[PDB]
Design a protein around this ligand. Structure first.
Ligand SMILES: CN1[C@H]2C[C@H]3CN(C=O)C[C@]31C(=O)c1c[nH]cc12
Length: 130
């Protein structure tokens, strides 16, 4: 229905606003663009599904996310990719791990405060009907 397409439009507006707020935070600069194959040729041999905040905006606009659950699986993949690629005790690996945890925790905190639970449940029931 037109009403269901208005529901998914409102979801995309909400997801673009949360993603912009994460992308401008200086802590999360390393997560804003794909890893350059030049500088890290090893990356795409270890990490089988790369993800970053520029790719997330492109996915919103391609209508890849019908629920906030869907979106949070890609925020969780940005964070788990950084934990698995940088697992060592040295300061450069500990710094990116602490940033990746802060990106995940910050996204979940904004959604807990600003997402209405009944809006999410509506998106889930339209998705399950298709
Ligand atoms: C997005 N979803 C739904 C449910 C809830 C369960 N989750 C599993 O990962 C995260 C979660 C969340 O934080 C919400 C805040 N309002 C609605 C929601």
């Amino acid at each position: 229905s037109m009403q269901e397409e208005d529901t998914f439009r409102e979801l995309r507006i909400f997801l673009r606003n949360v993603t912009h707020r994460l992308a401008i935070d200086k802590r999360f600069r390393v997560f804003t663009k794909p890893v350059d194959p030049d500088e890290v040729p090893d990356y795409r041999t270890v990490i089988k599904e790369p993800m970053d905040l520029s790719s997330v905006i492109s996915k919103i606009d391609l209508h890849k996310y019908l629920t906030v659950k869907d979106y949070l699986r890609d925020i969780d993949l940005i964070c788990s990719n950084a934990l698995e690629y940088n697992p060592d005790r040295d300061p450069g690996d500990r710094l990116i791990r602490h940033r990746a945890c802060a990106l995940r925790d910050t996204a979940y905190a904004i959604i807990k405060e600003e997402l209405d639970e009944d809006f999410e449940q509506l998106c889930e029931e339209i998705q399950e009907s298709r």
